[PDB]
Amino acid sequence: EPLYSLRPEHARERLQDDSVETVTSIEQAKVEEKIQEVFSSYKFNHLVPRLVLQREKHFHYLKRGLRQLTDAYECLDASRPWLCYWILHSLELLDEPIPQIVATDVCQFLELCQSPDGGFGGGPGQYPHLAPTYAAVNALCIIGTEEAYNVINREKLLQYLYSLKQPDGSFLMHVGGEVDVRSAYCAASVASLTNIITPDLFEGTAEWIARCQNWEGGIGGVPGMEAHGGYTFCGLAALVILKKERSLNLKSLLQWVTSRQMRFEGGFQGRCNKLVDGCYSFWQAGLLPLLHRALHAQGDPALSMSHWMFHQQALQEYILMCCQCPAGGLLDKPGKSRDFYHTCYCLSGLSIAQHFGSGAMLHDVVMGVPENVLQPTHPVYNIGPDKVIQATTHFLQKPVPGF
Amino acid sequence: GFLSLDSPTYVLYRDRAEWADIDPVPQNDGPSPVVQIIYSEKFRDVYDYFRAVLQRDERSERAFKLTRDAIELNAANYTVWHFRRVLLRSLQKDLQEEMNYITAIIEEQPKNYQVWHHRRVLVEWLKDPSQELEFIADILNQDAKNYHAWQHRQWVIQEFRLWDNELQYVDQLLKEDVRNNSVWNQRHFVISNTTGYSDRAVLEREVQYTLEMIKLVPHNESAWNYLKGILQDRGLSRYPNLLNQLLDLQPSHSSPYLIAFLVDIYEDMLENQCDNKEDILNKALELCEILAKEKDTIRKEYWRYIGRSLQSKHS
Ligand SMILES: Cn1cncc1[C@H](O)C1=Cc2cccnc2[C@@H](N2CCN(C(=O)OC(C)(C)C)CC2)c2ccc(Cl)cc21
Ligand SMILES: CC(C)=CCC/C(C)=C/CC/C(C)=C/COP(=O)(O)OP(=O)(O)O
Numbered sequence: 232e233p234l235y236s237l238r239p240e241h242a243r244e245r246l247q248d249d250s251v252e253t254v255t256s257i258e259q260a261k262v263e264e265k266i267q268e269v270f271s272s273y274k275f276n277h278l279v280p281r282l283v284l285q286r287e288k289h290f291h292y293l294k295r296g297l298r299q300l301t302d303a304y305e306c307l308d309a310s311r312p313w314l315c316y317w318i319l320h321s322l323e324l325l326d327e328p329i330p331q332i333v334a335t336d337v338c339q340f341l342e343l344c345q346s347p348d349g350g351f352g353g354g355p356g357q358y359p360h361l362a363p364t365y366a367a368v369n370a371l372c373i374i375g376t377e378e379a380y381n382v383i384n385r386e387k388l389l390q391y392l393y394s395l396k397q398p399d400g401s402f403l404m405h406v407g408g409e410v411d412v413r414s415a416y417c418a419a420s421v422a423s424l425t426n427i428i429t430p431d432l433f434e435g436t437a438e439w440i441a442r443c444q445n446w447e448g449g450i451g452g453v454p455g456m457e458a459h460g461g462y463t464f465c466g467l468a469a470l471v472i473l474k475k476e477r478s479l480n481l482k483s484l485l486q487w488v489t490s491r492q493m494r495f496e497g498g499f500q501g502r503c504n505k506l507v508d509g510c511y512s513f514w515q516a517g518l519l520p521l522l523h524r525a526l527h528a529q530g531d532p533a534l535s536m537s538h539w540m541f542h543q544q545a546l547q548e549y550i551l552m553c554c555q556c557p558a559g560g561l562l563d564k565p566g567k568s569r570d571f572y573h574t575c576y577c578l579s580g581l582s583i584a585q586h587f588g589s590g591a592m593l594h595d596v597v598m599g600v601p602e603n604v605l606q607p608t609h610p611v612y613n614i615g616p617d618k619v620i621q622a623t624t625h626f627l628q629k630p631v632p633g634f
Numbered sequence: 635g636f637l638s639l640d641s642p643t644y645v646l647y648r649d650r651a652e653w654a655d656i657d658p659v660p661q662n663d664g665p666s667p668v669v670q671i672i673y674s675e676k677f678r679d680v681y682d683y684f685r686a687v688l689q690r691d692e693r694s695e696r697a698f699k700l701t702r703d704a705i706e707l708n709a710a711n712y713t714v715w716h717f718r719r720v721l722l723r724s725l726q727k728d729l730q731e732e733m734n735y736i737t738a739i740i741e742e743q744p745k746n747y748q749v750w751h752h753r754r755v756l757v758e759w760l761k762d763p764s765q766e767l768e769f770i771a772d773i774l775n776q777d778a779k780n781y782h783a784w785q786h787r788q789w790v791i792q793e794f795r796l797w798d799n800e801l802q803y804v805d806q807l808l809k810e811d812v813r814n815n816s817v818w819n820q821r822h823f824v825i826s827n828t829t830g831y832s833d834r835a836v837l838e839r840e841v842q843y844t845l846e847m848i849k850l851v852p853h854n855e856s857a858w859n860y861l862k863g864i865l866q867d868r869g870l871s872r873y874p875n876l877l878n879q880l881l882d883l884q885p886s887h888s889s890p891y892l893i894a895f896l897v898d899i900y901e902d903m904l905e906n907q908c909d910n911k912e913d914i915l916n917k918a919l920e921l922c923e924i925l926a927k928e929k930d931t932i933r934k935e936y937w938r939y940i941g942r943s944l945q946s947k948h949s
């Protein structure tokens with residue numbers, strides 16, 4: 232019918248296991264049967280399909296979570312700036328305002344997470360780490376007040392990034408920590424937003440990230456590892472920031488990412504032969520605007536002037552039909568419990584799937600009710616494009632710190 | 635003298651005699667809190683005591699046992715892991731007992747980043763990789779796609795030069811699940827770091843093995859990605875027999891993967907000044923249209939992009 236996933240021909244997209252069953256085919260078939268039940272529900276209940284983003288339920292879930300969380304969140308006690316970021320960004324995508332008092336309370340809490348040696352920890356008094364540093368800077372840029380900008384100690388932040396920098400061009404996540412592509416992205420994101428990029432900070436970084444692109448076309452956590460959506464987004468987004476996307480084979484990358492959209496489910500998988508997951512709506516589909524900008528900068532004449540190189544409609548259908556929790560919040564797939572991480576990325580991926588843009592060109596695809604339209608998101612930073620412009624302009628009136 | 639966190643006789647640190655001297659330090663969440671977690675009593679109790687030993691930098695046997703509880707409560711707390719490693723060195727703890735502990739904790743939470751990083755630090759300290767491959771194989775026996783397990787496996791093999799039995803282990807896992815992409819990745823990792831793919835006998839063996847895998851399971855994307863990945867290097871057009879050999883699977887072993895591979899062969903032929911240039915282009919454009927409209931419509935935008943791209947370049 233008007234919904235791609237509900238067309239009779241869509242039944243042909245089901246798994247073809249070639250009569251050879253393995254753990255992979257068995258697990259995929261189970262997910263497909265579950266998704267088919269969701270897709271068929273309208274037909275079985277004799278109702279007209281209505282794709283509605285449950286804005287009010289999502290807002291209630293988010294406004295509450297911003298102040299207080301159950302003990303189910305104990306496993307995120309060293310990730311508190313991530314929770315600020317996930318919630319504040321989900322509220323920004325839903326066009327929900329931050330009361331000036333809440334903005335102030337977030338600023339003050341992120342100040343407590345900030346290390347006297349630079350960067351942010353996952354909670355008050357915790358050691359600094361690149362992942363809560365990225366989340367804290369992103370959350371402060373979402374608030375975007377002078378008070379939020381002033382929380383960041385730019386000189387100590389630069390000193391902190393230098394303390395993690397490795398001779399091979401990579402970065403540690405934290406002191407005595409692990410090295411992987413996420414760290415290059417977390418460092419490049421905070422350094423570009425706060426205007427602390429010195430001539431040698433990212434020396435060898437582009438080359439180290441390019442060594443993470445493997446035989447599949449995608450990018451692994453470290454050289455030699457299996458290509459993965461989260462790492463591929465981190466790798467490409469860091470190269471966009473560094474203006475070094477050409478270090479990658481962009482065509483093998485384009486082919487690998489597009490192949491990650493599931494023909495049946497419509498959503499994206501994180502790796503080849505794994506299951507669909509709503510958060511890959513951002514990590515994987517977020518690569519298509521980055522590749523479009525990269526190919527366009529090389530003057531590609533065959534690029535679309537209205538759509539991203541993925542099925543925008545099928546992704547929105549997967550998110551709207553399978554990833555909404557009735558009580559508010561979004562999830563990985565049907566049968567999974569809601570969480571602020573999936574709420575953030577399902578809505579981020581929905582915004583990307585709704586909003587196309589390339590220079591002068593602007594084209595929206597809004598599946599279901601028109602009220603489903605979200606605020607746009609910057610494909611590099613995953614914060615509002617207006618917040619990116621405002622933060623960059625503000626930090627550009629400050630000099631890059633000296634030694 | 636361990637008192638397990640799940641033990642029916644576990645007692646809160648605030649009710650323990652050997653901890654009476656120390657005042658627990660509460661978390662400073664500020665006056666108006668945000669993303670405040672309503673911690674369970676057990677969690678709050680261990681973390682208020684951990685905050686006290688950390689703030690005073692107490693490098694004691696009791697602080698060491700306390701980190702085990704704090705890790706058990708939240709194994710992602712990297713500050714706790716850092717302090718535990720400070721204590722392992724300061725207290726001169728037996729690192730083989732610490733390996734027994736990390737083995738048990740990884741078995742419980744095999745997806746946690748911190749646990750694998752700690753195991754790597756221990757292996758580095760001990761300069762002992764002897765237990766590694768067998769421990770990883772036990773994790774992979776439970777989840778054959780565990781990304782941290784495969785990453786630790788590659789680190790182990792590369793660092794300690796344990797290449798010799800890896801292709802055999804890869805062959806075993808591929809028999810179990812030919813669709814396991816992490817295993818196809820390991821295959822490439824092993825070959826590229828040993829013989830390489832420049833050795834013609836190795837390349838031939840790999841392409842034949844992959845083609846036999848494709849015949850058994852034609853819709854298995856991993857084997858198709860692997861065949862492409864090992865040949866795309868020198869260029870698909872460099873292998874003239876490949877096209878005819880795939881075109882001979884068109885009635886029997888067809889899939890949008892076979893069709894997509896044909897388009898990749900045609901793209902490369904068109905870039906390397908092939909004979910019957912206009913014929914190749916139209917063959918490629920026909921397959922692009924079939925893929926976009928019929929066989930692979932989820933990728934319609936990609937296939938239309940390729941169609942336009944091929945036209946723009948090779949018209
Ligand atoms: C890779 N992937 C893709 N879908 C999911 C994942 C992973 O589960 C995953 C994603 C991720 C990405 C960025 C920052 N933090 C995390 C974190 N999540 C944990 C679960 N969670 C969460 O709310 O759980 C509750 C409180 C409901 C139990 C959301 C945050 C995490 C922490 C350790 C590890 Cl090994 C993996 C992950
Ligand atoms: C900026 C930043 C910190 C980005 C993080 C990116 C991200 C999502 C990373 C995931 C890394 C990883 C080892 C996943 C494996 O888990 P899995 O078993 O869930 O993978 P799968 O979904 O393919 O099964």
Ligand SMILES: [Mg+2]
Pocket residue numbers: 404405407408409712747748751
């Ligand atoms: Mg760590």
Ligand SMILES: [Zn+2]
Pocket residue numbers: 508509510511563573
């Ligand atoms: Zn997910």
